[PDB]
Write a protein that binds this ligand. Structure first.
Ligand SMILES: *[C@@H]1O[C@H](CO)[C@@H](O[C@@H]2O[C@H](CO)[C@@H](O[C@@H]3O[C@H](CO)[C@@H](O[C@@H]4O[C@H](CO)[C@@H](O[C@H]5O[C@H](CO)[C@@H](O[C@@H]6O[C@H](CO)[C@@H](O)[C@H](O)[C@@H]6O)[C@H](O)[C@@H]5O)[C@H](O)[C@@H]4O)[C@H](O)[C@@H]3O)[C@H](O)[C@H]2NC(C)=O)[C@H](O)[C@H]1NC(C)=O
Ligand SMILES: *[C@@H]1O[C@H](CO)[C@@H](O[C@@H]2O[C@H](CO)[C@@H](O[C@@H]3O[C@H](CO[C@@H]4O[C@H](CO)[C@@H](O)[C@H](O)[C@@H]4O)[C@@H](O[C@H]4O[C@H](CO)[C@@H](O)[C@H](O)[C@@H]4O)[C@H](O)[C@@H]3O)[C@H](O)[C@H]2NC(C)=O)[C@H](O)[C@H]1NC(C)=O
Ligand SMILES: *[C@@H]1O[C@H](CO)[C@@H](O[C@@H]2O[C@H](CO)[C@@H](O)[C@H](O)[C@H]2NC(C)=O)[C@H](O)[C@H]1NC(C)=O
Ligand SMILES: OC[C@H]1O[C@@H](O[C@H]2[C@H](O)[C@@H](O)[C@H](O)O[C@@H]2CO)[C@H](O)[C@@H](O)[C@@H]1O
Ligand SMILES: [Fe+3]
Ligand SMILES: [Zn+2]
Ligand SMILES: [Zn+2]
Length: 341
């Protein structure tokens, strides 16, 4: 029964998984794929059991019958009395971020600028900002709004990939895994920090975690919060301290998904794995920490306090919420109810 196959996206997640596999005594083992979509296909086939997905991929997976099992829960200020595992999730803030020094760039002058996105099909990097831009321009030509972008997972020959860098060697340009230099929350924010793009579409937490010495990475060493501004939907620009009043949307947390018939068994194993390797785990500082990987967000986001039970045993639609799923569907009309595989 009780062995789980985790699906890793790309070589760096594979290496973290192998460490996790070793430390867990083979209670968890690892399958690897090059994209999140390929990982979803392995799960459907029964060749892997589970992986942690962004809200946008939970929508893809959900249509194919996969179900949310546990959600990432980060440290909050309210609901404090309750344990992390039983605490309701709060969601994260999708923001658009620019350099202070890039004056007079607001939400209404984004057209023909250079953009940095986490990956195609992701909540804060794609679904929210592009959904808003389609609604606002009344056009599905979102591939023509920005002059140049890095949007991992789009056509490498297109302008949506012009700004992506690939790996050390310039290989794998625009692949939607951490081999691409500008992939993910951290990568899209690096794309901005290095002045490759004019705007990054990330979440509030990314700015804080990579500025003011919170990251020791070479590119983030000297970044100061005051050098950045959030774009609000009313045309204003605000300090990064003002995210609660200047965000594009609130996003549902990343969540572990699995096949419906495997859900209960994945849940049981993961709850025990976190008692051992989670934030306060028997073995975390010492042997291995599940929620660490030097700001790279491998398998799980680094700011994760725990994986939390869901409560209300929600479907993927209830988990994502009616607001979010209607945004995705309206945007999906640009690029029809059924599994994409
Ligand atoms: C955008 O993204 C940012 C990055 O994620 C994020 O900033 C992060 O915020 C969190 C908290 O929301 C910070 O975590 C905090 O760190 C501190 C120390 O660094 C930790 O130490 C203590 O933790 C205690 C337990 O939670 C905390 O008590 C909490 O609960 C009590 C209720 O009993 C309450 O305290 C009250 O304070 C009142 C105000 O003075 C006072 O009058 C009253 O009497 C009472 O004492 C608070 O709710 C309190 O939080 C202690 O106070 C300590 O804080 C702790 O673990 C805590 O989680 C991150 O450090 C911070 N990240 C960074 C890198 O700076 C933003 O919040 C995000 N913004 C938006 C808009 O979402
Ligand atoms: C891009 O634009 C598209 C098109 O406009 C947007 O899609 C629309 O999104 C709207 C908001 O998500 C959505 O509006 C509707 O809102 C009503 C009212 O919501 C209610 O809210 C109450 C809060 O007090 C709550 O208690 C209620 O339960 C309820 O949720 C919704 O209700 C309708 O249906 C009822 C049937 O039971 C009916 O009686 C009632 O009169 C309402 O008509 C409704 O479900 C919906 O949420 C609207 O549906 C969307 N339009 C289309 C064409 O799909 C995208 O969101 C935009 N994208 C982005 C990124 O912003
Ligand atoms: C591998 O999984 C097994 C089965 O869950 C674990 O063995 C159990 O561990 C618990 C608590 O540590 C004990 O109380 C049980 O008696 C054990 N036997 C069972 C339930 O089969 C084992 O701990 C796991 N190994 C690691 C390191 O994760
Ligand atoms: O409009 C009726 C609609 O209610 C749904 O509840 C949504 C709600 O609309 C949304 O604002 C919130 O964020 O998410 C919940 C779902 O968790 C319900 O899901 C639908 O069945 C229903 O059509
Ligand atoms: Fe996300
Ligand atoms: Zn809001
Ligand atoms: Zn329900």
């Amino acid at each position: 029964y009780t062995r789980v196959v985790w699906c890793a996206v790309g070589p760096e997640e594979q290496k973290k998984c192998q460490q996790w596999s070793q430390q867990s005594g083979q209670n968890v083992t690892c399958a690897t794929a090059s994209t999140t979509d390929d990982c979803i296909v392995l799960v459907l086939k029964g060749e892997a059991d589970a992986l942690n997905l962004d809200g946008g991929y939970i929508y893809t997976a959900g249509k194919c019958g996969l179900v949310p099992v546990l959600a990432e829960n980060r440290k909050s200020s309210k609901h404090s009395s309750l344990d992390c595992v039983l605490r309701p999730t709060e969601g994260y803030l999708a923001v658009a971020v620019v350099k202070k020094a890039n004056e007079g760039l607001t939400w209404n002058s984004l057209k023909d600028k250079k953009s940095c996105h986490t990956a195609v099909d992701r909540t804060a990097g794609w679904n929210i900002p592009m959904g808003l831009i389609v609604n606002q321009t009344g056009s599905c030509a979102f591939d023509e709004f920005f002059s140049q972008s890095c949007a991992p997972g789009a056509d490498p020959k297109s302008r949506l990939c012009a700004l992506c860098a690939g790996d050390d060697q310039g290989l794998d340009k625009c692949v939607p895994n951490s081999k691409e230099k500008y992939y993910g929350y951290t990568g899209a924010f690096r794309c901005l920090a290095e002045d490759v793009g004019d705007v990054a579409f990330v979440k509030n937490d990314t700015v804080w975690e990579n500025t003011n010495g919170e990251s020791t990475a070479d590119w983030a060493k000297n970044l100061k919060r005051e050098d950045f501004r959030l774009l609000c939907l009313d045309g204003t620009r605000k300090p990064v301290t003002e995210a609660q009043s200047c965000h594009l949307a609130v996003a549902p947390n990343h969540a572990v998904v699995s096949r419906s018939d495997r859900a209960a068994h994945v849940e049981q194993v993961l709850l025990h794995q976190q008692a051992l390797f989670g934030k306060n785990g028997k073995n975390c500082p010492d042997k291995f920490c599940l929620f660490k990987s030097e700001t790279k967000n491998l398998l799980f986001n680094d700011n994760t306090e725990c994986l939390a039970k869901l409560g209300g045993r929600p479907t993927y639609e209830e988990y994502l919420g009616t607001e979010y799923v209607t945004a995705i569907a309206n945007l999906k009309k640009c690029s029809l109810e059924a599994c994409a595989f």
